[PDB]
Design a protein around this ligand. Structure first.
Ligand SMILES: Cc1cc2nc3c(=O)[nH]c(=O)nc-3n(C[C@H](O)[C@H](O)[C@H](O)COP(=O)(O)OP(=O)(O)OC[C@H]3O[C@@H](n4cnc5c(N)ncnc54)[C@H](O)[C@@H]3O)c2cc1C
Ligand SMILES: Cc1cc2nc3c(=O)[nH]c(=O)nc-3n(C[C@H](O)[C@H](O)[C@H](O)COP(=O)(O)OP(=O)(O)OC[C@H]3O[C@@H](n4cnc5c(N)ncnc54)[C@H](O)[C@@H]3O)c2cc1C
Ligand SMILES: O=C(O)[C@@H]1CCCO1
Ligand SMILES: O=C(O)[C@@H]1CCCO1
Lengths: 393, 384
């Protein structure tokens, strides 16, 4: 039958499976032993106690620099501490060809600058780049997949070839739900392209608030096995939740492509981490979160054996450094963290900044709850898997 | 339909190149006024530059009782308030009913706090029609307006009972006509006779703005209601641009064109203060200075007022209100509610404060000179 028919059918089938039908297998994947659960709660308490023991709306704290040069110069402090970086030249959803070409030239120039600064440190210990496919096609969300792929793939391949030249990471950011299949098809074409052989820096984001997440992960892990590439997989919860809810309503959809209860995203994330941690031979998991409880859960789930290159954590510049200062370093948790680092002017920042406001301002967000006088540390270290597992059915 | 309504619909998506020439001519001020406005603007901006994501800066209080207590300090300085129970784009009947009960409760508390001070010296309320109908942006006008009207009329009757102002906020461009039809039914309804508190917002970034204003001024003259007209630039520009691209624009696309539209519409409103109550809502000191001198030397309470958003306008208007400044009143738009209902409003404040074209961003930008800040937008548009 069609290549990867079973894996692809599973993804499409999940795209709007009832949320109640998506949950049970996730809870089974995410359940841990009492030793791990106790260890996790103990670590999360320590992290929160340190955090509460120690952000401006205008978002200056969210950009590392106006240019890649300034961004690279300002990164030496935290790299000396054991952090790494992933630089994102701000820009998305190009509306004209002129803009899409400027963004492409921005990524191209940035890869040259990051690659020189990496100075051969490789994809795990050295910096990398993150790109958005919507910046590289002037009608990314509107045009037919054939025309989009055909003009996008040459550009992304050229960028991946430069990143291979310097041996740095190149991560494809995850954006809106309706573009997941195109981006996955692009990942598969690159991972099977022989011109990129021998380079493991190709990376891909999967959003755990999506119903497709574990099946997308199944597909990617299988792709890593058949292609021979160790794919970098950034596991996130997701940055577009408000926009997806609204788009699903105006499109007349009966069922959303994303979870509607925040705890379900939490359990989905842990279930997907378990899948990724069992596959570190062929993928490099990158656990992007600012939630101390989520982090503690992954840390103890990953077991006691660790080496750089096994997995890493990630955080956004201006949000995660206080938490991960309690994580990076032999004297803390001895695990690395890559900082996603925006580069650009105030104007290019606003769309990213809106997503940060929706993140930092939501009552349900960890970063809001940690500053909330009415949220107890009891509630902050609460285990979302065990909370769900305990509800009688 | 009517000739005044037709001009509004004809203007909806009119080419921006055809909207501008009449606005420039209507916005043109005498050299004497422009020199005085330049001088007042520089004084304000110099004072402003001498001064300086939980969103706490933008909320007056979690409850109306809380917000009312915190208002007495600024009220005696010369400010008034328009309280907004946060809430918008209700998605279910339960939300719509709850927002209605919030507005109802606020009116009772604000009206009792007002204690007969009237619509110009006492506090008032602002509402959003999208809070009061479950599918406001997604249903048709006949269904929306016919279930919305009884609810808005009931609130207007409470506001009349207390003699406070009740303002309908302006939202997305495709809802203007619906809200405009509601305004007309209310202004011709005999149950509201003698109350001048009905208020309406008009967005100067919209190409229809001057024609909406003509319609409203004529409606006030023929109905005998002194409609309160809040002239704003507009809060939804990025969303209007994106919707039209995904779907010509109903809004201008150069910031300076909106600035010219505002001044032209302010000239229209200043000539009509007999029949409407203009409320010039802006944090831009150059815009404020222009309006101040356009209005002339004659002033009395109830002629017109300025307005600002809580947490944004106090540094500017502390240089305006009071007998030692410019002796003009300013009404503070005061959101009330939890941090949850705050988020949508906060996003619009972020786009406002963080845009490079915004006055409140440029006033803090060391790359922007005072000369650039007092620049007259009408004169800049003429040259280019
Ligand atoms: C380095 C880095 C890179 C990232 N890259 C991407 C990317 O390419 N694409 C992308 O989409 N996201 C990306 N994210 C994630 C996004 O930007 C947010 O940072 C992240 O979702 C916050 O989750 P958390 O574990 O920090 O915190 P939490 O406070 O634990 O979780 C918050 C998240 O819960 C989810 N959520 C909130 N309410 C509900 C609800 N009612 N129902 C279901 N789910 C809900 C949302 O995803 C929300 O962001 C990235 C994050 C980091 C740190
Ligand atoms: C008390 C009060 C009540 C308000 N009520 C409403 C309301 O009900 N509905 C509503 O929509 N707005 C409303 N506004 C206006 C909106 O919220 C902003 O506060 C206002 O638009 C900012 O204008 P300004 O004169 O302060 O600043 P400025 O910096 O002078 O002007 C900024 C404005 O220019 C416009 N603009 C920016 N870029 C462009 C561009 N490229 N092309 C064309 N135009 C552009 C936008 O409207 C932007 O807000 C209100 C404002 C106040 C103070
Ligand atoms: O752009 C965003 O908001 C997310 C976070 C980093 C990459 O994709
Ligand atoms: O809601 C908004 O953003 C504008 C400002 C005040 C009323 O409508």
């Amino acid at each position: 039958s069609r290549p990867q028919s079973t894996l692809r059918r599973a993804i499409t089938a999940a795209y709007r499976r009832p949320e109640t039908e998506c949950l049970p297998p996730l809870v089974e994947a995410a359940t841990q032993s009492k030793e791990i659960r106790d260890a996790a709660a103990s670590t999360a308490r320590k992290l929160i106690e340190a955090l509460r023991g120690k952000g401006s709306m205008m978002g200056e704290q969210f950009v590392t620099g106006e240019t890649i040069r300034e961004a690279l110069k300002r990164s030496k402090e935290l790299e000396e501490k054991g952090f790494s970086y992933s630089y994102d030249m701000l820009g998305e959803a190009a509306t004209t060809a002129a803009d899409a070409e400027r963004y492409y030239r921005d990524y191209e120039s940035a890869i040259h600058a990051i690659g020189k600064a990496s100075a051969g440190r490789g994809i795990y210990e050295g910096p990398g780049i993150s790109i958005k496919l919507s910046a590289l096609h002037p009608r990314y969300s509107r045009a037919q997949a054939a025309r989009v792929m055909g003009e996008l793939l040459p550009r992304v391949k050229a960028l991946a070839l430069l990143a291979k030249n310097y041996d740095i990471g190149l991560n494809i950011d995850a954006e809106e739900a309706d573009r997941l299949e195109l981006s996955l098809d692009l990942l598969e074409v690159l991972c099977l392209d022989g011109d990129l052989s021998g380079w493991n820096g190709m990376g891909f984001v999967v959003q755990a608030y999506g119903k497709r997440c574990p099946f997308v992960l199944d597909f990617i892990i299988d792709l890593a096995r058949r292609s021979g590439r160790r794919i970098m997989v950034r596991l996130v919860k997701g940055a577009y939740w408000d926009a997806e809810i609204k788009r699903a309503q105006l499109d007349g959809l009966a069922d959303f492509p994303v979870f509607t209860r925040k705890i379900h995203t939490d359990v989905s994330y842990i279930a997907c981490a378990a899948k990724l941690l069992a596959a570190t031979d062929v993928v490099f998991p990158q656990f992007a979160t600012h939630n101390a409880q989520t982090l503690a859960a992954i840390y103890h789930m990953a077991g006691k054996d660790f080496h750089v290159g096994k997995y890493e954590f990630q955080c956004l510049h201006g949000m995660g450094e206080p938490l991960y200062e309690e994580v990076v370093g032999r004297g803390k948790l001895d695990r690395p963290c890559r900082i996603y680092a925006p580069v650009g002017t105030h104007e290019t920042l606003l769309a990213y900044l809106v997503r940060r406001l929706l993140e930092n301002g939501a009552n349900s967000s960890f970063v809001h709850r940690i500053n909330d006088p009415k949220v107890s540390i009891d509630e902050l270290i609460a285990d979302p898997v065990e909370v769900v597992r305990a509800m009688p059915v």
